[PDB]
Design a protein around this nucleic acid. Structure first.
Ligand SMILES: [Mg+2]
Ligand SMILES: [Mg+2]
Ligand SMILES: [Mg+2]
Ligand SMILES: [Mg+2]
Ligand SMILES: [Mg+2]
Ligand SMILES: [Mg+2]
Ligand SMILES: [Mg+2]
Ligand SMILES: [Mg+2]
Ligand SMILES: [Mg+2]
Ligand SMILES: [Mg+2]
Ligand SMILES: [Mg+2]
Ligand SMILES: [Mg+2]
Ligand SMILES: [Mg+2]
Ligand SMILES: [Mg+2]
Ligand SMILES: [Mg+2]
Ligand SMILES: [Mg+2]
Ligand SMILES: [Mg+2]
Ligand SMILES: [Mg+2]
Ligand SMILES: [Mg+2]
Ligand SMILES: [Mg+2]
Ligand SMILES: [Mg+2]
Ligand SMILES: [Mg+2]
Ligand SMILES: [Mg+2]
Ligand SMILES: [Mg+2]
Ligand SMILES: [Mg+2]
Ligand SMILES: [Mg+2]
Ligand SMILES: [Mg+2]
Ligand SMILES: [Mg+2]
Lengths: 52, 104, 128, 187, 147
RNA sequence: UGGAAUGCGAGUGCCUAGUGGGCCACUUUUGGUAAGCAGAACUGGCGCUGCGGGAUGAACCGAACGCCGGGUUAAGGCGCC
RNA sequence: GCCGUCGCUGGCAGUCGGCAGAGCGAGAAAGAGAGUGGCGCGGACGCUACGCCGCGACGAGUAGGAGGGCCGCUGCGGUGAGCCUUGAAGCCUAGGGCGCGGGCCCGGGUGGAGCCGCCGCAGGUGCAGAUCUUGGUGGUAGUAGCAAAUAUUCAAACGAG
């Protein structure tokens, strides 16, 4: 039931959304994986530009 | 399953819990509702009220200078009446001193 | 040789008995701690006659003699010797009560200090 | 018993600020002293405004402080504010102004000082003029907040120009029935 | 912080802040925006007027960047250039007029709302407004277009 | 001479729970033979409210409640309980 | 008389001391103002101003709301030169008390290794009920009962029986 005054907001939570939840607890654990493979690449190409 | 149909029992007391207040009487009430042709001409009157300004001062300052020759042409018992005068903090200062000196 | 207070006023208490909980007598699951009865048909919270009483704010103690033991002193938990010097300039109005855990080897050298400082201890013969 | 009603016994004014900062709780100490120990109803207004929430003391613009200090008569006075003095980039000339506010944004300190005005604080003001003689109290617009556009008569009501709460605004977001004289009605 | 919430003062009261007569049942009005036309009509008409129906033309493959046109008003037009460009034209005497390029700042259209300072300008912009161009002539200045 | 009396600080703004089964009484009152019945109006109550009285008692009479001492009452009472 | 709430948008930075002079309760808008001419070395308390002090009025309450909890539970960052095998947690207690209360502190006992006060932080945080869940135990009660199908008796042996 709507209250006195507010928005007509449509929440898109009518599917089983708790099953397909994606949490970013590995975001700091992948920034280090990317940076590590970025320096393994900047060491594999020795004098060539690091950006490509 | 018959239920009570209608009543006004508590209503005259809910109305007065926060009082019944007459509306907010302001000066300069709105001009919505007034007839168009009249309220169309009142706008033409205001739109041109400035057109007679330099002539309006010539009379306001006139009757204000004339305000000079206007105005510069005209220009319970004796006991408790004397005690209520000695007992005045300001007016009785000297009737009080006249008594203080009295005992010398 | 009792350590008298500064002034010993008359202590008056508006009620002495505890405030037992409604129906803490018919049952053992209902402890004596007070719980304001909130039931609809309850006879205690309607303040009927001859029933249990309720802790109003009217029973409050005189602020002049609130928290004041029958020895005319207020109180203070003391966990070690160092917490007495905190109390040495409140000597004639507050007392010390060595904690329950302070062993007897320290509690002896606490009552020892409080004797010099003239601070009164409520449990000076505690453990021994 | 007495037949009074305690509906309104508790006046709801602010006895003290709700913030816990100590550079405000010291100003409120100094001005609570001036407020009670002087007979100037200026300090009482400054004190009563130091309590007010961040939405009741709004920001001032440099331009609104210009046009409120250009009014004839009030020259060589100190413009007191209790909120903050924000900049107003749509003004080109700035005179010299003696000002006293709680905050002055880092681009309004520039303009005022390059003009040649002073920027006092509330303690400097309290030392300059304790009773607050020579001052001009100001306060920014309070109905400026976008919040005050949804307040009033509810929308969908004859002559209620109140803004509704809508997810987005567009062709097909509350434009169909209670607005068109065609589709249904309009107010 | 649960220790600050309202369910910590609601321990011991039977209905937990929700009513003895009318309980706190699950959905006693339907779920969501249900009954927008039947039993929540006073609310969908007192507070969301115009929520029901169609209006206007559809536009299937709308791309929000064909209609990109951010505007800047004349009042804050002089804020796009540095300060030693507006005052250098004050101290200037050879009548030179600084070129304010707007599409370089990030606006396409120039609307004329504010007053202007009395000095010439050359406003390069993509779209101009009638009044924005008249307030520029009336001060002396040119409205360059840039495709 | 702030243009009757008496009284009293007012005005305004957001956010908002619970409620949307009611019942009783004086007086007026509709249906019904009537009902501790069904239905309205005004005010006061009970509900949400103890206390003294009515032996007893939701609603009657008095009177509304912080915890206490003295004094005096209301409505009811004063052979004995 | 005492407690509390509300109001006075009350009072107190003036503890202005031998660099002193101790006042702002009194019916009457405003200075115990300036200048310009006719011995003995002395004086309680206070003020965590989120504190302290003074005045009046007030004090019902379901559903509901709000505040204040130096009420309580478990962990986290700090901090108590914290407490503890000279005895921690837990539990018991006709012992002493505090607080209107939630609750708390001491004494005695038991126990054998961990625990708490404060300032903040966090929450799976407080039970009398839900024909609640799991476990334990009572009155009933030494009671109902040990009753379908005919039947047992004597002597001896083994054996503590
Ligand atoms: Mg609701
Ligand atoms: Mg809302
Ligand atoms: Mg009904
Ligand atoms: Mg019942
Ligand atoms: Mg009831
Ligand atoms: Mg009373
Ligand atoms: Mg009340
Ligand atoms: Mg209220
Ligand atoms: Mg309640
Ligand atoms: Mg329920
Ligand atoms: Mg609620
Ligand atoms: Mg409901
Ligand atoms: Mg719900
Ligand atoms: Mg229908
Ligand atoms: Mg119902
Ligand atoms: Mg009836
Ligand atoms: Mg009926
Ligand atoms: Mg009910
Ligand atoms: Mg009521
Ligand atoms: Mg009653
Ligand atoms: Mg009878
Ligand atoms: Mg009496
Ligand atoms: Mg009798
Ligand atoms: Mg109350
Ligand atoms: Mg026991
Ligand atoms: Mg947990
Ligand atoms: Mg249980
Ligand atoms: Mg048997």
């Amino acid at each position: 039931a709507p209250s006195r005054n507010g928005m007509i907001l449509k929440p898109h939570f009518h599917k089983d959304w708790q099953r397909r939840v994606a949490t970013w607890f590995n975001q700091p654990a992948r920034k280090i994986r990317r940076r590590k493979a970025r320096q393994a690449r900047a060491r594999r190409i020795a004098p060539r530009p690091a950006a490509g | 399953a018959k239920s009570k149909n209608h009543t006004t029992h508590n209503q005259s007391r809910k109305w007065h819990r926060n009082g019944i207040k007459k509306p907010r009487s302001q000066r300069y009430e709105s001009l919505k509702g007034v007839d168009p042709k009249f309220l169309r001409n009142m706008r033409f009157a205001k739109k041109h009220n400035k057109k007679g300004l330099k002539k309006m001062q010539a009379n306001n300052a006139k009757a204000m200078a004339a305000r000079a020759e206007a105005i510069k042409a005209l220009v319970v018992s004796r006991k408790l009446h004397r005690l209520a005068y000695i007992a005045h903090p300001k007016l009785g200062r000297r009737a009080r001193a006249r008594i203080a000196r009295g005992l010398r | 040789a009792a350590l008298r207070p500064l002034v010993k006023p008359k202590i008056v208490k508006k009620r002495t008995k505890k405030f037992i909980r409604h129906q803490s007598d018919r049952y053992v699951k209902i402890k004596r701690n007070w719980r304001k009865p909130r039931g609809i048909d309850n006879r205690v919270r309607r303040r009927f006659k001859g029933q249990i009483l309720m802790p109003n704010i009217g029973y409050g103690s005189n602020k002049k003699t609130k928290h004041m033991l029958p020895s005319g002193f207020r109180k203070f938990l003391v966990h070690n010797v160092k917490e007495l010097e905190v109390l040495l300039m409140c000597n004639k109005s507050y007392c010390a009560e060595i904690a329950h855990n302070v062993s007897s080897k320290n509690r002896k050298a606490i009552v020892e200090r409080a004797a010099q400082l003239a601070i009164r201890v409520t449990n000076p013969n505690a453990r021994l | 018993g007495v037949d009074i009603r305690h509906n309104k016994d508790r006046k709801v004014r602010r006895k003290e600020p709700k913030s816990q900062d100590i550079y405000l709780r010291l100003l409120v100490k100094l001005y609570r002293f001036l407020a009670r120990r002087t007979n100037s109803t200026f300090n009482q207004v400054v004190l009563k405004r130091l309590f007010m929430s961040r939405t009741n003391r709004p920001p001032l613009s440099l331009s609104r402080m210009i046009r409120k200090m250009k009014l004839p008569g009030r020259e060589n006075k100190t413009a007191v504010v209790v909120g903050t003095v924000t900049d107003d980039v749509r003004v080109q000339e700035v005179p010299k102004l003696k000002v006293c506010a709680l905050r002055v944004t880092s681009r309004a300190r520039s303009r005022i000082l390059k003009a040649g005005g002073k920027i006092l604080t509330f303690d400097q003001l309290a030392l300059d003029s304790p009773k607050g003689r020579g001052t001009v109290l100001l306060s920014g617009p309070r109905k400026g907040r976008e919040v005050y556009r949804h307040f009033g008569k509810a929308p969908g009501t004859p002559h209620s120009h109140t803004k509704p709460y809508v997810r987005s605004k567009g062709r097909k977001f509350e434009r169909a029935r209670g607005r068109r004289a065609s589709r249904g009605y309009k107010n | 912080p649960s220790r600050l919430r309202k369910t910590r003062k609601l321990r011991g009261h039977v209905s937990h802040g929700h009513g003895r007569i009318g309980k706190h049942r699950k959905h006693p009005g339907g779920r969501g925006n249900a009954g927008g036309m039947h039993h929540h009509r006073i609310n969908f008409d007192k507070y969301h007027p115009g929520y029901f129906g169609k209006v206007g033309m559809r536009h299937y493959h709308l791309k929000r960047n064909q209609s990109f046109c951010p505007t800047v008003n004349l009042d804050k037009l002089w804020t796009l250039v540095s300060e030693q460009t507006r005052v250098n034209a004050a101290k200037n005497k050879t009548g030179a007029a600084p070129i304010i390029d707007v599409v370089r700042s990030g606006y396409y259209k120039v609307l004329g709302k504010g007053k202007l300072p009395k000095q010439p300008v050359i406003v390069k912009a993509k779209f101009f407004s009638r009044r924005a161009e008249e307030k520029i002539k009336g001060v002396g200045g040119a409205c360059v277009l840039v495709a």
